Design a protein around this ligand. Sequence first.
Ligand SMILES: *[C@@H]1O[C@H](CO)[C@@H](O[C@@H]2O[C@H](CO)[C@@H](O)[C@H](O)[C@H]2NC(C)=O)[C@H](O)[C@H]1NC(C)=O
Ligand SMILES: *[C@@H]1O[C@H](CO)[C@@H](O[C@@H]2O[C@H](CO)[C@@H](O)[C@H](O)[C@H]2NC(C)=O)[C@H](O)[C@H]1NC(C)=O
Ligand SMILES: *[C@@H]1O[C@H](CO)[C@@H](O[C@@H]2O[C@H](CO)[C@@H](O)[C@H](O)[C@H]2NC(C)=O)[C@H](O)[C@H]1NC(C)=O
Ligand SMILES: *[C@@H]1O[C@H](CO)[C@@H](O[C@@H]2O[C@H](CO)[C@@H](O)[C@H](O)[C@H]2NC(C)=O)[C@H](O)[C@H]1NC(C)=O
Ligand SMILES: *[C@@H]1O[C@H](CO)[C@@H](O[C@@H]2O[C@H](CO)[C@@H](O)[C@H](O)[C@H]2NC(C)=O)[C@H](O)[C@H]1NC(C)=O
Ligand SMILES: *[C@@H]1O[C@H](CO)[C@@H](O[C@@H]2O[C@H](CO)[C@@H](O)[C@H](O)[C@H]2NC(C)=O)[C@H](O)[C@H]1NC(C)=O
Ligand SMILES: *[C@@H]1O[C@H](CO)[C@@H](O[C@@H]2O[C@H](CO)[C@@H](O)[C@H](O)[C@H]2NC(C)=O)[C@H](O)[C@H]1NC(C)=O
Ligand SMILES: *[C@@H]1O[C@H](CO)[C@@H](O[C@@H]2O[C@H](CO)[C@@H](O)[C@H](O)[C@H]2NC(C)=O)[C@H](O)[C@H]1NC(C)=O
Ligand SMILES: *[C@@H]1O[C@H](CO)[C@@H](O[C@@H]2O[C@H](CO)[C@@H](O)[C@H](O)[C@H]2NC(C)=O)[C@H](O)[C@H]1NC(C)=O
Ligand SMILES: *[C@@H]1O[C@H](CO)[C@@H](O[C@@H]2O[C@H](CO)[C@@H](O)[C@H](O)[C@H]2NC(C)=O)[C@H](O)[C@H]1NC(C)=O
Ligand code: NAG
Ligand code: NAG
Ligand code: NAG
Ligand code: NAG
Ligand code: NAG
Lengths: 50, 281, 198, 55, 74, 165
Amino acid sequence: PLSETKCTLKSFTVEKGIYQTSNFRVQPTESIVRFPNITNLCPFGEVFNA
Amino acid sequence: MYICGDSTECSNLLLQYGSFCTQLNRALTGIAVEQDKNTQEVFAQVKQIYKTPPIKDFGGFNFSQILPDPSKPSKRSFIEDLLFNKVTLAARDLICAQKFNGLTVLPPLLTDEMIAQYTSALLAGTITSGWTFGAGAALQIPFAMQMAYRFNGIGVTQNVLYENQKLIANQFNSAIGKIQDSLSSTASALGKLQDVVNQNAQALNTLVKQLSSNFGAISSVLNDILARLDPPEAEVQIDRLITGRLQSLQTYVTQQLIRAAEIRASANLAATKMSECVLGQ
Amino acid sequence: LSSTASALGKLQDVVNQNAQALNTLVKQLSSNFGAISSVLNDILARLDPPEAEVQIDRLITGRLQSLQTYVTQQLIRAAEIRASANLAATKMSECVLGQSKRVDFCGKGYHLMSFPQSAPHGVVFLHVTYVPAQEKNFTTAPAICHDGKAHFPREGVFVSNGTHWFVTQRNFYEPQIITTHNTFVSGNCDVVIGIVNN
Amino acid sequence: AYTNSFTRGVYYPDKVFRSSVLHSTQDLFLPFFSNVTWFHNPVLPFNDGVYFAST
Amino acid sequence: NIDGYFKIYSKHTPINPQGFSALEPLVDLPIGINITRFQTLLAAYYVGYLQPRTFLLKYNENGTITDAVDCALD
Amino acid sequence: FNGLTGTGVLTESNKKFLPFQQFGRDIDDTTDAVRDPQTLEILDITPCSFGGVSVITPGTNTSNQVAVLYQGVNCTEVPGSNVFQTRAGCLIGAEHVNNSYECDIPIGAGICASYQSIIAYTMSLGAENSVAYSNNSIAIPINFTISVTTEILPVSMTKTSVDCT
Ligand SMILES: *[C@@H]1O[C@H](CO)[C@@H](O[C@@H]2O[C@H](CO)[C@@H](O)[C@H](O)[C@H]2NC(C)=O)[C@H](O)[C@H]1NC(C)=O
Ligand SMILES: *[C@@H]1O[C@H](CO)[C@@H](O[C@@H]2O[C@H](CO)[C@@H](O)[C@H](O)[C@H]2NC(C)=O)[C@H](O)[C@H]1NC(C)=O
Ligand SMILES: *[C@@H]1O[C@H](CO)[C@@H](O[C@@H]2O[C@H](CO)[C@@H](O)[C@H](O)[C@H]2NC(C)=O)[C@H](O)[C@H]1NC(C)=O
Ligand SMILES: *[C@@H]1O[C@H](CO)[C@@H](O[C@@H]2O[C@H](CO)[C@@H](O)[C@H](O)[C@H]2NC(C)=O)[C@H](O)[C@H]1NC(C)=O
Ligand SMILES: *[C@@H]1O[C@H](CO)[C@@H](O[C@@H]2O[C@H](CO)[C@@H](O)[C@H](O)[C@H]2NC(C)=O)[C@H](O)[C@H]1NC(C)=O
Ligand SMILES: *[C@@H]1O[C@H](CO)[C@@H](O[C@@H]2O[C@H](CO)[C@@H](O)[C@H](O)[C@H]2NC(C)=O)[C@H](O)[C@H]1NC(C)=O
Ligand SMILES: *[C@@H]1O[C@H](CO)[C@@H](O[C@@H]2O[C@H](CO)[C@@H](O)[C@H](O)[C@H]2NC(C)=O)[C@H](O)[C@H]1NC(C)=O
Ligand SMILES: *[C@@H]1O[C@H](CO)[C@@H](O[C@@H]2O[C@H](CO)[C@@H](O)[C@H](O)[C@H]2NC(C)=O)[C@H](O)[C@H]1NC(C)=O
Ligand SMILES: *[C@@H]1O[C@H](CO)[C@@H](O[C@@H]2O[C@H](CO)[C@@H](O)[C@H](O)[C@H]2NC(C)=O)[C@H](O)[C@H]1NC(C)=O
Ligand SMILES: *[C@@H]1O[C@H](CO)[C@@H](O[C@@H]2O[C@H](CO)[C@@H](O)[C@H](O)[C@H]2NC(C)=O)[C@H](O)[C@H]1NC(C)=O
Ligand SMILES: *[C@@H]1O[C@H](CO)[C@@H](O)[C@H](O)[C@H]1NC(C)=O
Ligand SMILES: *[C@@H]1O[C@H](CO)[C@@H](O)[C@H](O)[C@H]1NC(C)=O
Ligand SMILES: *[C@@H]1O[C@H](CO)[C@@H](O)[C@H](O)[C@H]1NC(C)=O
Ligand SMILES: *[C@@H]1O[C@H](CO)[C@@H](O)[C@H](O)[C@H]1NC(C)=O
Ligand SMILES: *[C@@H]1O[C@H](CO)[C@@H](O)[C@H](O)[C@H]1NC(C)=O
């Protein structure tokens, strides 16, 4: 991180204190998709198993 | 995060407008450090922490409703508790101040109990030693003689105090009880603080509310627009949304700068009053 | 002053803020702003007027936005500097040209005098102040009962060193004997709380 | 008769839950303190919605 | 009826006008017809008509509507 | 979930949805809870954490050690050195003591780190003393000193002019 502070201040010496470097975000790992129960499916065997 | 919202093409479009984020963050950080300096210079007027004597015989005056008590955990006095309960609009419900859109509330540098310790130190010093603790080191002096010296400074001879000590003590006790009751019962007495809080909250709310406007594009959400059209010709709408949100952000920052200026003026006035009317006459 | 640094923090901060604002104004001239090139000459001399108009319009609106922002920031900063200059004018009018009886306005202690000095873009005051030291205890009393009457001090306070009673001024220990010329009488003493025979 | 619909006819505009807030909506409502044409059959018009009460 | 969807709300059977009670949706039907008139089957029924308006609704602590005010009355 | 798309952390909740209601909402039209269409249960939604980092340094002239403070994140999902959990975020690389010194790098909520090894502790307002208040005693100085101070005040800044064209 010291190199990051040196970048942000644009100097090769940094005085005593607290500095802000950047921000981070937690990256999502998984994708979840949900849909209701599969019911009343289209009749297909009534024109085949007739 | 506020403008784009986690999309690579939006970031690619945005990075070519210059370095607006840099000066925005610089302005906000300047405001925050100014606030910390405000509080520090208002309260920290003393070097040590004087403590009230265990035995209280202040010539008949009764201070028990201002000096802190040990039963409460926060070590705040009675009037301070009335004033804290009256401002309705942090235990453990913390580390949860962030919102869905990128915006955060940083915690103040001086915790409430430290401010309580400061005011207790100031008030015990001025009860025991007078004003001499603002010039050099505290020098004790009984309260009756300090009150006689304080009469003698408005042109009233000091005979008037020692033959009317009981009348004055009774009037002071009655007046302090009366102010306690008036503050406890009557509401709408803390106008200034509540107005400040309401103004800040309303500005934040309208800033958030502004996020859901078409601005002349197809829609108000980037994902739908980028997923419905083609990248060669879906960049104009993204550009429109970027420009609109930049405009709203600049407006909000400027309003905060103005308000911070006026609060700074008020803090300076409070520091002057606290230095000239408490630590002296 | 000569050895230690960082005393002149405020003036240096002002200069740094102004320099940074000007630099970030100048630096905004290389941004594309949605056009096809940052430089105006090539884009003017490389395409037809119908599209050159659009590109130049985008560049113009971007640059106007940047310039407006810079002007507004300058106005805010000038306002705060004006407030500070008014405070300095007041302080020089009151503490240099006269003695200030208002507490903690000029220094820490009682005020005696001030001397001003210049600086690059500011002023520097050298206040001179009085500060006591080496205290003691003694034993006080509000009145003295003599012949049934109560005597109070004109200016000063009664103290005792163990055996005798004296009147001394508040801010310095210079004991004096008690005579009628520096004490005044008011009524009998059966109502004052802490009278002492003498 | 032409009795007055005092405060009748507010219906949940949508399926979004919401708790202890005050919302402002723009929707097709029956205005407060209006006349309802009592009846006792005619082919009444429809003209974008109808409230129908009975007892 | 709005853009192809025919919506029927209701409050079914309140037990005793006057008062306040919101109406919860029952059915939505996706057809879409040029519709202009209607007629009941076989008895006295009050009838009222709906028009665009702006309302302010106060939701309960449990998601139920407990109060509402008009916005163009007085 | 059933059309609506978003990013977040799903938690078991205890809301009281009405049967015809599908998904909840907040004050500012930001989704808060959703009913899952498989078992009819309520799931609260919490956005994934963020927060700017910061670096605490004692100055390159002294040493090259730093302590990294993450702001406003429960210090469990941060990923080396001692991990300190405070009320302003969490510190990495700074050891915690049980004392109180007046401090010089304030980081917040009463905590403020300083160099020794980079420790982090709680402020101490001042040396706690008590004056022996008695109702018949005073304290009169017997000597004095004369002290000279300074004050620095800016009065003007640089004048600049810019031509628009
Ligand atoms: C969707 O289907 C699943 C599985 O067919 C149902 O889950 C079962 O629900 C019954 C309720 O009568 C329970 O007794 C079973 O224990 C459940 N089994 C499992 C594996 O979950 C679910 O209830 C159905 N939901 C809807 C809304 O139709
Ligand atoms: C100074 O004022 C306080 C505040 O009233 C007095 O405390 C009261 O004490 C009496 C007797 O102990 C109680 O009955 C009251 O309830 C107390 N007041 C409150 C508000 O609780 C205190 O007594 C006063 N000082 C002296 C020396 O009497
Ligand atoms: C001066 O005013 C005070 C109160 O403002 C008077 O004191 C009151 O006198 C009455 C009658 O003697 C008593 O019942 C009250 O208890 C007193 N009040 C207090 C607080 O002690 C006083 O009498 C007035 N003096 C003159 C000369 O008018
Ligand atoms: C308090 O001060 C008085 C006045 O100076 C002291 O009285 C004198 O003390 C000196 C010696 O300390 C003697 O030589 C004088 O004769 C004393 N004067 C008289 C009139 O008797 C007194 O001693 C001091 N108190 C103490 C405890 O030293
Ligand atoms: C100052 O000193 C004390 C402070 O509490 C009090 O003096 C008491 O006075 C009574 C009656 O005169 C005596 O019975 C006590 O023994 C005294 N106590 C002490 C410690 O001296 C009173 O408040 C004040 N006394 C004087 C004389 O001013
Ligand atoms: C100060 O002197 C007066 C005058 O002698 C004293 O007053 C006497 O007190 C005694 C005892 O209380 C009484 O018996 C007398 O009647 C009072 N009067 C006279 C003329 O003697 C007073 O007590 C003295 N006080 C002190 C602290 O020494
Ligand atoms: C909102 O709903 C909750 C939970 O359904 C209610 O809280 C409890 O509901 C049970 C249901 O019989 C009662 O027996 C309890 O007395 C309720 N407790 C409390 C603290 O209210 C709540 O009452 C409902 N609020 C309404 C309907 O306004
Ligand atoms: C960071 O998150 C953890 C996990 O939730 C917190 O530890 C729990 O905190 C809750 C209160 O928020 C307690 O009821 C649990 O007993 C804690 N331990 C568990 C769940 O194992 C931790 O407090 C959070 N850190 C904070 C808030 O600073
Ligand atoms: C005046 O007398 C008081 C009481 O005798 C002194 O206060 C105490 O001084 C002793 C000196 O050893 C300390 O140990 C105590 O802690 C002091 N009391 C308190 C409450 O702090 C006081 O120091 C004397 N004044 C001077 C100038 O010596
Ligand atoms: C008041 O303080 C001053 C110094 O602050 C004392 O003067 C010093 O006295 C010592 C002892 O003789 C000398 O060595 C110094 O040279 C003196 N300083 C100066 C500047 O002259 C002075 O004595 C103190 N007052 C009293 C009454 O003791
Ligand atoms: C007809 O029945 C057979 C089972 O005998 C099944 O495998 C087939 O899928 C059915 N036809 C259709 C169209 O489903
Ligand atoms: C209903 O109509 C009658 C007459 O047709 C009229 O007097 C009355 O004011 C109307 N009610 C309202 C609420 O306008
Ligand atoms: C009504 O009929 C017109 C044609 O006359 C058609 O354009 C429109 O879509 C129809 N709408 C409905 C709701 O049936
Ligand atoms: C670096 O400079 C600072 C400036 O005050 C000084 O305090 C420190 O001791 C210096 N470090 C070394 C190693 O000399
Ligand atoms: C501080 O003291 C407590 C109790 O004495 C102890 O449990 C804790 O470990 C100490 N902390 C440190 C950093 O030594």
